[PDB]
A paper describes a structure:
Wzc, an integral cytoplasmic membrane tyrosine autokinase protein serves as the master regulator of the biosynthesis and export of many bacterial capsular polysaccharides and exopolysaccharides. Wzc comprises a large periplasmic domain, two transmembrane helices and a C-terminal cytoplasmic kinase domain with a tyrosine-rich tail. Wzc regulates polymerisation functions through cycling the formation and dissociation of an octameric complex, driven by changes in the phosphorylation status of the tyrosine-rich tail. E. coli Wzc serves a model for a wider family of polysaccharide co-polymerases.
Here, we report the characterisation of the structures WzcK540M2YE (Y718E, Y717E), WzcK540M3YE (Y718E, Y717E and Y715E) and WzcK540M3YE_N711Y (an additional N711Y mutation) corresponding to different phosphorylation states. One intermediate, 2pY which has Y713 at the active site, does not follow the YxY pattern, since position 711 is asparagine. We show that it is binding of the i-2 tyrosine to the tyrosine pocket (where i is the number of the residue positioned at the kinase active site) orders the tail between the tyrosine at the active site and helix α23. A mutant of 2pY (Wzc3YE_N711Y) stabilises the C-terminal tail was functional in vivo, restoring immunoreactive CPS to levels approximating the wild type. This is consistent with a model in which the more stable the Wzc octamer the higher the Wzy activity. We note the reduction of CPS production by destabilising D28A and K701A mutants further support this model. The Wzc3YE_N711Y shows greater phosphorylation relative to Wzc3YE and proteomic analysis of purified WzcYF_713Y/N711Y reveals both N711Y and Y713 are phosphorylated. We propose that the YxY pattern serves as a molecular ratchet, that by selecting a tyrosine over phosphotyrosine, ensures phosphorylations in unidirectional (moving from the C to the N).
Author numbering:
A (entry chain H), B (entry chain A), C (entry chain B): 17 to 64, 85 to 261, 409 to 477, 494 to 714
């Protein structure tokens, strides 16, 4: 491989690359803007050692004392239903509410799993509130204590707007101690001095400084039954989430996944990409037809279409190839369905009719031929009725209205399509038509699916295959050619159909307007 | 690859290389001259240890004491609207102003984000000044204190020119302490001695020395409730920005980006560069025409042009190639539009007419032919009107004025250009003209876009393709030749057009004046 | 590559190699002889530790005390206008002057940048002197103090010759301390003993020893409020610049730059170097003509020239090649101008005329032919006038005086040179001349520039190309041959012209005298 190939591949897949990278970067931005910020407070302690003091600070006696002093076993969480409600509320500038609770005693359900009882408190005004544990609604008032239904609560100084809801949990003392220990750090910072740096993290910048001051006071008071050089203050800039590294990670991750996905698609492609793939195998390509982005004949509705220009190129190529052919019959076939055989056949018939030659178009697709719909029809008396013997050769020929050539439709779909085509009446029809017309074009079903084209091809002096631009593979076309050669039918060459513009190709068609 | 190639590439791209390097170096110089200089002061302290003293110096008690003593919570910034105003003002030799403020109390808005209140003070004279916080204009006088609108201010010794504006911020004490700590360093410098080196950086060389003296005095006074060997002095040479390394980095960065960009363009080029690329594929090149930097025929306006000399070379080559041709008709075509087919065709007709031969020029580009504009025209009765049957072969031929040959214009643009050219009247016209002229030159549309040239080429004894020097690729020309061969038209060879001088080429044309 | 090639390349480029190396070595010698010498003094101190004493010696208290004692803030510099004046003065044996100044007070301008005031003192005699700060001229006398114009000066013991000028600077105390600190070093030299080695460098060998003695005394005196084992003495041999390493570096740098430059030129050469380069491509070389270092014909002025000998070799080669040629016409052409086509053509005509054969020389360079100047002329009625029809074939032929052959000049420069040559009168002239002469030689313009030679070559039975020895490339000659072949002109072979002696060649011509 070379760099031009990969650059063209990136240019072609730019829509997917951009979409994937933008999606990943949007998710990264949403996380870096909706994650709750985490602040850090710290304090500095003087030791007159300092290895066992580190274990004494993190022990459950000191931390438990702090928790008892500060009532850290009463967890209060402002309620937002979604997982992004809190982040949005912070972004909108809404001030978070808080409640001071000095006494809480839940009935302590203490079942197998839920060791932490919790209730929901809804604020009705600055004074009263509603409480529900499991649907049991009670009304309480700030100030006066509540002792009802096995529930004790004392609420002071509700500072929020009415309608807010708060989850109040009474978690066990060990759970509180473990929570405090997880966010608490002690370090020496000199490895030999009596200086210890205590650190604490949390989402409330005032609460963490109060908690660290409590820890320092408890440790100092316990030791004298040590000097606090720096009492706890909180850095106002949150330490998490780290926004810029998150966004950079998101962008780079999006780019790498996009690149590997494009590499995956490029390594898994097998369709035809240029006429050179067919010409390596030894197959003549007579034209490349682009997709016309424009029940009508294209060569009649839009004669100045680019696909019709490419078909005029095919017309001039054929006028030279079909010299020294045994008769004036051309058969168009292909490997797979919807490659474009009917499109090519009918539009070629129209462009050859505009030059003043008499053209007969035969729809010999007895299984799915729709040419009568595309030309305007009297669907009676098609090729079926003629072959089965219930029609004559003069009742089946009709005129294309905006075209200028004659045609024969398929007729009624028969039960034995391949066997009807083997009747000698088919060759009688071809020999009769070959004397009243300058050209006969026969449209057929694909050869890999059924065998009708190989029957028809015995009486055609020229045979061309239609290959679809991206769908078909080189192996398919080669197998189709060999299946034709085995039945005694020589295939003159190929027509590539439905070509589109690709930056990776480096093959230049003339698929652009000139005028 | 070899070194001659890369040297030629650099010579060719020197304009881009020089421009990019000069832009990057100019940006580096602008930064190294507009960045505010940062000075450094330092002091030396004697310790009679020295590991915990390092943590005691950087603690908030000592630094906070210094900040309280020196009023470092009053931030004063001289106001320049742009981000380069201060640098320009320093470069112009303008002396920065300063104000001594001993008492500041802003109303402490203290909203969600802006924790630092700030006002703007405009100097009206040496005595009075104007103050605005949020549009509230007040007048104050140096000396007498101001207590108005919840704002307290005391300003002493305004030393600036009238019209200056200063931002006065009252930042919080922790913010001041963090600012001081960021620019403050303590080191041991012997790792065992009682010597400590204290360092401080900042943009004011006197303020930083005062701050470091205050820190040293506070630490010394606190310890005795230590010897200061060296009091703080400031190195007069700024430590940042480091100009020479910045400029060197800018130059080297410019060179590397230029080299990679030129390498990128060289690896992405696919156009034809020399006739050897076409001759490898097996295509005869009959001439290489340079760009003529000079609605007129070039071979008539400037007969001594270099392009006309190259076209005389083509004339002598053709006089030998067109021997043993079936008729005296030459068709010029090409792959893509604006390769130079009309330019070559018409100028070749002029140079062959000056040698005394009778020449007919036919503009068979029925879609975009403009030869009638370039020759001086009676636009009626062109090739269209003749082919469609509404004109005779004697009414369509006209004389080029400054030329010396006959011509046929396209006529009115028809709706069916390819089908008009297929009329037997075209061959009748060619056979009639072939007996009254020594040479007929036919100009055509490009073959990749439309098929008209392949129709015309059946009656031309000689056919040449025009390839544009840098635009076309070898694949394009090969595809054009094969599309012609498929239609039964043998292409004699190619003409390379619009060649220019490239140091990387190492192919020598004769594109220079001799006279 | 092999060693013989590179040795020959060095032999050929020896002039450049020697010049570059000599230039670099001369610059190195000039630096190593003009750089001011820097002396070193040192002293040895005993410590009864020694880690903090190192920081105490380099502190600003001790160094500042030394500077105050020795008045090191008075900088005196003897004035030389150029940057090599001092070095030359030292080399000429001139004794540097000195002035003892005990009191200096400049007005202390103290602007934004120039913190160091300076004045210029011009010595008028042993007693009086002139002083100028900014053009303000004052007269002072040794002894009596000066207090004028805000300037205080006391000068003692002027020891210099009259006319000398000295810059006297009053630099700030910190600048003096930093200057002293930069040149001062302290080391332990045992890493554990009480021995310290103090070192000081400077351009004055007595001043530095005095300064180091002052530093030692101040440190010793301060400590007792330490033993000086060795007081300061100066090594009389300067420590910088180190001459031999500088000169060796200069020589080696010159050699490496010379070698890379010669390698650069050798890798960038593309011209023809030997006839073998042309014979690989399949081109017969019939002669190699050397440069003749000798408006005259060389074969007449200096018949025993080496170039004329090589041309006699060409004459004998041609007498055998031109057998079985269709006529007796020889055309000489070439690729590029000033390859030597006229030189070869005319001198070949002279050497063939001395053998008793009748020779006609035709100057068919209608664009820049100067043969009439070189033969002695009647410039009227040349080839132009004949072709345009205004002269006959008998009025245009003239005699070369010192030669022995006939010639036709170009005539008046025409506006249509290529079209004049296409007249059938040219072939009439050639057919008439072919019956009255044994040989006709035609000189032409180069074929890459214009096409005239390809027109003339149709009527020449033999055609030779001239290639210039170093200017032309193999690609040029091959392109010229192919441009001739395309026009139906067969080129017999080549003549290499202007060959010179190259040690790298290893191709031996016979370009030496034999006689
Ligand atoms: N180059 C093309 N541009 C636009 N439409 C095309 C092109 N080729 C085929 N088609 C359309 O795509 C559809 C499938 O092609 P069709 O010719 O009917 O398939 P089949 O090979 O089975 O006979 C048709 O509706 C056809 O009109
Ligand atoms: N070697 C050239 N030097 C200067 N101008 C040129 C050269 N070749 C083409 N042109 C000019 O560039 C324009 C486009 O070329 P043209 O011959 O008209 O294109 P086309 O190939 O479509 O017929 C024209 O205006 C032409 O005169
Ligand atoms: N081998 C040579 N030795 C000395 N002078 C030479 C040699 N070859 C050419 N010259 C001189 O160098 C100049 C340029 O060569 P000239 O023959 O006039 O060039 P051109 O190829 O254009 O006809 C002339 O003055 C010529 O006399
Ligand atoms: Mg179909
Ligand atoms: Mg054109
Ligand atoms: Mg000459």
């Amino acid at each position: 491989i070379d760099l031009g190939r990969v650059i063209g591949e990136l240019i072609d897949h730019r829509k997917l690359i951009i979409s994937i990278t933008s999606v990943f970067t949007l998710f990264a931005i949403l996380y870096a803007l909706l994650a709750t910020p985490i602040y850090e407070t710290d304090a500095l302690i003087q030791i007159e050692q300092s290895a066992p003091e580190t274990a004494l600070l993190q022990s459950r006696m000191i931390l438990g004392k702090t928790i008892d002093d500060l009532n850290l076993q009463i967890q209060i969480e402002q309620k937002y239903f979604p997982v992004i409600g809190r982040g949005l509320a912070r972004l909108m500038g809404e001030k978070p509410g808080n409640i001071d609770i000095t006494r809480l005693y839940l009935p302590d359900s203490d079942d197998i799993s839920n060791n932490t009882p919790s209730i929901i408190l809804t604020v009705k005004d600055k004074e009263n509130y509603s409480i529900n544990s499991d649907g049991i609604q009670l009304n309480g008032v700030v100030g006066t204590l509540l002792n009802e239904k096995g529930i004790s609560l004392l609420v002071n100084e509700i500072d929020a707007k009415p309608g807010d809801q708060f989850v109040i949990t009474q978690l066990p003392r060990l759970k509180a101690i473990s929570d405090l220990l997880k966010s608490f750090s002690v370090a020496d910072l000199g490895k030999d001095t009596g200086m210890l740096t205590l650190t604490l993290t949390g989402d409330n910048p005032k609460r963490i400084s109060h908690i660290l001051d409590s820890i320092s006071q408890n440790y100092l008071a316990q030791n004298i039954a040590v000097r606090i050089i720096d009492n706890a203050v909180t850095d106002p800039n949150p330490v998490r989430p780290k926004k810029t590294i998150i966004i950079v990670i998101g962008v780079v991750l999006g780019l790498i996944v996009s690149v590997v996905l494009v590499l995956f698609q490029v390594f898994l492609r097998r369709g035809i990409e240029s006429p050179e793939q067919l010409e390596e195998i030894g197959i003549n390509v007579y034209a490349s037809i682009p997709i016309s982005e424009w029940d009508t004949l294209l060569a009649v509705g839009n004669p100045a279409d680019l696909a019709v220009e490419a078909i005029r190129g095919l017309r001039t190529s054929l006028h030279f190839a079909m010299m020294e052919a045994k008769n004036n019959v051309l058969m168009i076939s292909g490997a797979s369905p919807s490659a474009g055989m009917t499109f090519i056949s009918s539009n070629l018939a129209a462009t050859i009719a505009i030059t003043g030659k008499k053209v007969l178009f035969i729809d010999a697709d007895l299984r799915k031929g729709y040419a009568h719909k595309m030309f305007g029809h009297k669907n009676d008396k098609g090729l079926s009725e003629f072959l089965s013997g219930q029609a004559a050769a003069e009742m089946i020929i009709d005129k294309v209205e905006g075209g200028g050539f004659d045609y024969i439709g398929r007729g009624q779909i028969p039960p034995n399509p391949a066997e009807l085509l083997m009747h000698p009446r088919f060759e009688q029809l071809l020999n009769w038509a070959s004397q009243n017309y300058d050209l006969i074009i026969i449209d057929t079903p694909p050869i890999l699916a059924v065998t009708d084209a190989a029957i028809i091809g015995r009486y055609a002096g020229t045979c061309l295959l239609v290959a679809r631009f991206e769908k078909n593979t080189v192996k398919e076309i080669d197998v189709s050619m060999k299946r034709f050669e085995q039945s005694g039918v020589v295939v003159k060459g190929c027509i590539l159909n439905g070509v589109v513009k690709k930056a990776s190709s480096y093959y230049r068609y003339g698929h652009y307007h000139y005028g």
